[PDB]
Amino acid sequence: MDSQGRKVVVCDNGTGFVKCGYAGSNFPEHIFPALVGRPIIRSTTKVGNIEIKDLMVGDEASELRSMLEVNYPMENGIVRNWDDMKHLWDYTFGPEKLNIDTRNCKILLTEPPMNPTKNREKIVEVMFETYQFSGVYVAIQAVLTLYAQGLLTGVVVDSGDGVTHICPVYEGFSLPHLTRRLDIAGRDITRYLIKLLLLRGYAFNHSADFETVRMIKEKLCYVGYNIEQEQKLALETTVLVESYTLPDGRIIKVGGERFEAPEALFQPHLINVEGVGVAELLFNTIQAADIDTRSEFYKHIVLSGGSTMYPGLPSRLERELKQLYLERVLKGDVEKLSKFKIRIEDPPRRKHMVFLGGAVLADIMKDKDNFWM
Amino acid sequence: TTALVCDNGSGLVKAGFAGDDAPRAVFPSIVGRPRHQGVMVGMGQKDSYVGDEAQSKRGILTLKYPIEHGIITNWDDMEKIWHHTFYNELRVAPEEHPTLLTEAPLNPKANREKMTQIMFETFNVPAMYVAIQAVLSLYASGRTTGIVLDSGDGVTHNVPIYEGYALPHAIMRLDLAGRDLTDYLMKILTERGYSFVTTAEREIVRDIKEKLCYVALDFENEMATAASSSSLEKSYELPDGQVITIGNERFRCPETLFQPSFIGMESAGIHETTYNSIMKCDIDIRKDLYANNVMSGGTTMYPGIADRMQKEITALAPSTMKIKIIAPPERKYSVWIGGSILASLSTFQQMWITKQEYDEAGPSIVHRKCF
Amino acid sequence: TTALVCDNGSGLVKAGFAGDDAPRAVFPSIVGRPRHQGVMVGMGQKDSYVGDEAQSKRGILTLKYPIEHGIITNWDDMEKIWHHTFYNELRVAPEEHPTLLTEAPLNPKANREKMTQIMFETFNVPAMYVAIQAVLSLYASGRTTGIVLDSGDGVTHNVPIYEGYALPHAIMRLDLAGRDLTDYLMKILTERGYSFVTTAEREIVRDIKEKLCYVALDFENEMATAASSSSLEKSYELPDGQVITIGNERFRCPETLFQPSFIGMESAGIHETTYNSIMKCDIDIRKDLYANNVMSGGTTMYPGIADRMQKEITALAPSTMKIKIIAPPERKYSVWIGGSILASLSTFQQMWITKQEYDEAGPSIVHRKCF
Ligand SMILES: Nc1ncnc2c1ncn2[C@@H]1O[C@H](COP(=O)(O)OP(=O)(O)O)[C@@H](O)[C@H]1O
Ligand SMILES: Nc1ncnc2c1ncn2[C@@H]1O[C@H](COP(=O)(O)OP(=O)(O)O)[C@@H](O)[C@H]1O
Ligand SMILES: Nc1ncnc2c1ncn2[C@@H]1O[C@H](COP(=O)(O)OP(=O)(O)O)[C@@H](O)[C@H]1O
Ligand SMILES: [Mg+2]
Ligand SMILES: [Mg+2]
Ligand SMILES: [Mg+2]
């Protein structure tokens, strides 16, 4: 912490989850969803004795969502409802949760790359025009991964809730032109899972329902390692079928949808998106890099963001890269592939915007923070 | 006290102490400027990387050479190379140590003057001397007669010497040398579809040339065989593991030395150029300039290049006298070894340039001690 | 009897009968295959659209271009384009008509050989020839000497010519052209909050490149003035009726040609490339090339490109030389009009690869007869 005793905070401003903690903490103290919402009377629900404020925000708006019409202020990394966005931060720093409650302590911001410039600039306005912060910085979202991982060279794969990014960094140099986006992220996988359950005859349609299929997604879904083996095991045997309990207690059952939904990351054509799956977009990025740098990117693939948590994703991802390298570099000279040293950093800790390297290793007291000006 | 010996070649700098048998440091004469913005703390970036530090990191660095065709063209890089030479490779304080430098012949006098100035005016050397690269090779090969053939990365030059006396009027120089054979290889590889482009890749094309190319003993016969047999095709493995197959290209590259028309210039090949030099010398000494044809420099390392020379010179010379190329194993460092001899010898100390004389007379002194 | 002139460049295919003044047909070299399952049995038959159908149906098609950087990459799709060219677009069957194809320099020879094999085996043409695209552009001008600059969709290259002699060593090429300028526009529009990502939408971003972008005569003045006011903020309609409007993105894309470091390539821009090629030419040619820069190809259509290029070379070249830039009004068709002139030429009627010569030598004949 500062020699002035000031504290420093990180907000990921995540499109789905705000994630907050003090500088140097190995954990966030508070994880909560970015929902903001208003009370709505619904026929299908008994109105409780629990008091509902005229604006619920954050974790409270998630548990009481059954009474609430909920918005996300952030979509695909761009603020799309600026008033709820203000109210989400006004909740974050208030007496509740991360009670700094003050101008004096510093905040780090994380912006996605290739972000429409006005989005960045309005944040830098309100941080100094409303909270009147004493210290602010906006960091390249990709580099924070490598700071936390303790690396300087590697290609960062960063699938959040809103958008997926790939960003190479080579020995600390930013290579910008090798940036890529893929418009598949945790939100689209959720909507696609809604459709897959609709075929199985469960209807979900309320905004309060979106959180429920997210909780389904997080607990039952996984990425197929050999997609042919998953399909045969679904066709031949019943074991993939598993139960879940909805809020009203309906004991719904879900089957091969557990893997058919996450697979969209490798097959964007299952959703409407026309492109290439995460593995092939990652491979084309490395192949575009200058020829000597490729040798290191294959050894330092680095994973970030909650949509990378799906069981088996590192294993599936490694398979597609090995097969791509066999097909297109070794030109099918199969036995040579024993020489292809490839490695994926997939550390089980993977809310990978932790703050240690970005704050305390960058300043205890310094002229780097932007300041009131 | 011990002198330093330094061969400031375009291509590879070679430096070491006098009286040692081989250079103590060899490193590429490249200064790299990072072409991308750094973003990380703890990176340790700086305004430039040099030598092995640059070669080993070129995926970020726009490599440029300071020396073009044997002329120093950017003193603000060359000063950094010399700085790297003394303090990082040899780890020596220069003000203690006099130094023998090298130059090619027919090099513009402004280059030699600025070079001697930088030595006294910034590194504060006690004393120094400038020797012609060719001349040192006869020291290395231990003899006092021969037409020296020396070919670096940036110059090919020929210097007939007899009875210890040089014949300046018969000096012949060509700018076709190792780098133009690298660009040529980089051009012709486009025929097989390898699009090597930009400076960080040119160093890879060099690594192919430095390992797969060879000199044909009968060019059109090798062409006909390459056009009909895969025996001459070889394969090389790129840094990402993409293998490539090379053939016909392998010998069509260094053939350029014997047919400079391949790179578009109408000067005669090195064989005709060496023969011209002999035929321009005095009649009596020709009979043993056809012996003692001493090769030097890394561009003479190609397999068979000694033999192709012997064949073609024999086809040009009268048959009643005998050609014999001299081609040491050490020839890549022969120039430096020749300096390592010369700087160690007695009878050289009284003919350094010394800082007292330099400040008295200025850099125009080089034309009155050196050759 | 009559020859066919067929500029199978990347981007837009151009074909027509020799001697005609402008192409009979031009259409995009794209093959469009359906990205949804074909399910309306009946009219919805076609499994692969080519050309103007694919360009039109693009909403449902994954368009792809079978020529990448001037190198043909999918030969089955390329065959469909030629088949479309002869039987559907020209409506003349190939068996009676010799074909003039044309190609960029330093392409892999395998491209030239297979293109010929397809011509004799599949379309069964009487004879054919493969001119280099640059000299065709020089013919169209009615010009005996000049330095040609073709800037296609996929390749930009300089070829200097004097008295109709070519200078192969001075040929130089850059793989940056109208495609990568479009892909860069398809990034920088995201800075403003649009998003184009599908292959069909890349056709819309090309369209806006043609209509709104221009080369800055003074880029840093243009940047500073663009920040002052909406005076540049031109507006354009998407097919959906969404309206987009653009500021400094108008010139930042064209500027990539002069500062390739925007797309991260290390090569110099087209101005410094042009001057570098003249410096490779023989010295007495140079004065006459400065008076006869001839621009060609669609990428040279941007407003002000002739003036900007003149300014850059005038600064870079010796101040006594009179730099002028030949930018014909019709220069988009210059390559095809040049072919139409060559295929009419009474001397050229000997130069064809005639069928029996391929029947003798196989595909390798192209390296004997063609330039
Ligand atoms: N264990 C898990 N398995 C699968 N998905 C998860 C898991 N944990 C979180 N997610 C998903 O990851 C997304 C949130 O990730 P996060 O990194 O917080 O995105 P952002 O930081 O951009 O808000 C949500 O879609 C959430 O459902
Ligand atoms: N084994 C080899 N085969 C072919 N060419 C070589 C080989 N080794 C080096 N070369 C070429 O010979 C050149 C010689 O340059 P160098 O010897 O440094 O010149 P100088 O005589 O000025 O020191 C090298 O730059 C390289 O291009
Ligand atoms: N004003 C313009 N009119 C037409 N095409 C233009 C214009 N400006 C730029 N272009 C671009 O020029 C390219 C067409 O060049 P093309 O004729 O294909 O060259 P080549 O056929 O030699 O490859 C396309 O990318 C097109 O967008
Ligand atoms: Mg996130
Ligand atoms: Mg040397
Ligand atoms: Mg063209």
Side-chain angles (χ1 to χ4, degrees), chain C residues 253-289:
Chain C
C253 282
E255 193 63 21
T256 302
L257 292 172
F258 304 91
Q259 305 190 45
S261 57
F262 290 3
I263 64 166
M265 283 172 57
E266 188 164 327
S267 181
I270 71 172
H271 60 296
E272 182 168 336
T273 302
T274 293
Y275 180 76
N276 283 185
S277 76
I278 296 173
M279 296 296 95
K280 290 296 187 182
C281 296
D282 207 332
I283 191 170
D284 200 26
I285 295 172
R286 295 179 184 163
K287 166 177 276 275
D288 298 346
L289 298 181

Side-chain angles (χ1 to χ4, degrees), chain A residues 169-335:
Chain A
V169 167
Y170 186 86
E171 295 189 4
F173 291 87
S174 176
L175 284 76
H177 64 288
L178 305 184
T179 303
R180 299 291 183 270
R181 288 165 73 277
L182 179 65
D183 294 82
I184 303 292
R187 196 162 294 172
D188 305 297
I189 303 299
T190 307
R191 299 199 215 86
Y192 175 43
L193 181 61
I194 291 172
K195 183 163 289 190
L196 278 167
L197 295 182
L198 185 70
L199 269 62
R200 203 157 295 291
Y202 308 100
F204 299 91
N205 286 100
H206 302 289
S207 54
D209 298 334
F210 209 113
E211 282 274 273
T212 304
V213 289
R214 183 182 63 73
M215 294 165 191
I216 292 171
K217 183 175 69 79
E218 291 173 14
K219 298 302 180 185
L220 280 75
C221 290
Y222 73 96
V223 161
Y225 174 69
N226 176 353
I227 185 61
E228 194 279 330
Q229 196 76 246
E230 313 296 343
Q231 288 284 1
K232 184 167 59 72
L233 203 72
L235 180 70
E236 287 268 313
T237 187
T238 191
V239 300
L240 304 183
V241 177
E242 195 164 328
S243 303
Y244 186 87
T245 51
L246 296 184
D248 69 354
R250 284 188 71 206
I251 184 73
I252 69 170
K253 290 190 176 185
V254 186
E257 302 77 11
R258 290 170 66 174
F259 72 85
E260 295 270 33
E263 180 64 15
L265 280 168
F266 294 84
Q267 298 196 52
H269 80 88
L270 300 180
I271 297 179
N272 197 37
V273 175
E274 183 268 294
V276 305
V278 170
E280 187 161 8
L281 182 65
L282 175 61
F283 191 78
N284 288 353
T285 295
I286 295 157
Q287 286 285 301
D290 205 344
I291 186 165
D292 67 336
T293 68
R294 307 178 190 153
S295 67
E296 301 301 345
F297 293 164
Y298 292 125
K299 293 184 295 168
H300 295 283
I301 298 151
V302 184
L303 274 55
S304 166
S307 304
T308 66
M309 296 294 204
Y310 299 125
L313 178 69
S315 306
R316 177 60 175 292
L317 185 55
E318 190 184 306
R319 189 176 67 79
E320 295 245 348
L321 286 159
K322 279 174 167 170
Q323 295 186 210
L324 279 163
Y325 187 82
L326 175 60
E327 178 186 275
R328 302 183 185 173
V329 180
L330 303 177
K331 300 305 306 294
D333 192 18
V334 184
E335 64 180 36

Side-chain angles (χ1 to χ4, degrees), chain A residues 12-17 19 141 158-161 305 353:
Chain A
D12 303 1
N13 294 331
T15 295
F17 291 82
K19 297 177 280 288
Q141 174 179 305
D158 193 21
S159 193
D161 199 48
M353 300 286 94

